[PDB]
């Protein structure tokens, strides 16, 4: 019924405070109101930017100019990656820390990179595993090094990518 995240722009900030004019003594004088409005409306801008200072620092929306700072703390350097996929690698490596490389587990990680039906996985008798891609939205060669990391120590892997079925 209520949002748990209380960090939001204050609703109707301006009309508040004006509500504290005692008994409409000054209201309708058009000389005191403008003086008060001019000062209060400055806080509006500062109040608004208080959110982006917290909202924009999250990894989901962080821009490349500062996303590097988030990656730097985790040891994931930009190298030659671009912004749209640099976000992906950060997620992939971080998610690897609570993984076991099971068949059900592997499907889950690939799920975040190719939608619901964009990926499928065949399995083979002698350590063979196969990955199929149908709806890639980013160039895969630069993402490939991580795709190896979350697999068992002895996996034998093939990678094939195509658009659609």
């Amino acid at each position: 019924l209520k949002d748990v995240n209380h960090i939001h722009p204050l609703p109707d900030f301006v009309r508040g405070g004006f509500d504290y004019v005692p008994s409409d003594i000054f209201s309708g004088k058009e000389n005191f109101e403008q003086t008060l409005r001019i000062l209060l409306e400055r806080l509006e801008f500062i109040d608004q930017k208080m959110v982006e200072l917290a909202e924009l620092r999250t990894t989901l929306n962080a821009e490349d100019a500062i996303l590097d700072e988030i990656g730097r703390q985790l040891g994931i350097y930009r190298n030659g990656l671009n912004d749209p996929e640099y976000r992906a690698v950060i997620m992939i490596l971080t998610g690897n820390n609570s993984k076991s490389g099971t068949r059900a587990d592997i499907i889950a990680t690939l799920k975040q990179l190719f939608g619901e039906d964009g990926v499928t996985t065949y399995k083979g008798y002698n350590y063979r595993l196969d990955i199929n891609i149908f709806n890639t939205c980013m160039e895969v060669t630069d993402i490939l090094p991580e795709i190896i990391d979350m697999l068992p120590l002895v996996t034998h892997l093939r990678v094939v990518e195509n658009q659609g079925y």
Partner: protein, 163 residues
Amino acid sequence: QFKDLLLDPLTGDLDFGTPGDRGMRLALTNQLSLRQRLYLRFAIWAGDWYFDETFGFPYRTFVGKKTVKAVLDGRIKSEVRQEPDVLQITDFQSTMDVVSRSYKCFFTVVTAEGEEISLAFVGEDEYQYPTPPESNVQLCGDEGVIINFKNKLYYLINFRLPK
């Protein structure tokens, strides 16, 4: 707001509920709680409940004796005000019949209603924790951004042409 097991006003047994929702209920509204708090307070004769000799009403003083109506009304009207959440008593029609020797009074009591302070012990929660995204929507965008824009364009094309 005193919570307690709900007593049926019609029968006096516990209010297990209608046949479609049989169960057990707690007295939540202050009105229901106060009703039974007065009912028990008046129904238990003074001294007849073990573990508390001081609880109850002393009917034996009046019943069976030649008594003055005015004295009885004072005691009846006094026991009510022992509850800490009674605002006032509106009217009091005390009448006595000498032929049948019966006595019967009428009156009403006014009580306000309070807040619940905390819902931790009762049922539900008032927060709206977020829902995790689905599929590759987070890392690649969402289609709804296209659908809403298409709908806005269609409705704007609808608006300009007079209708």
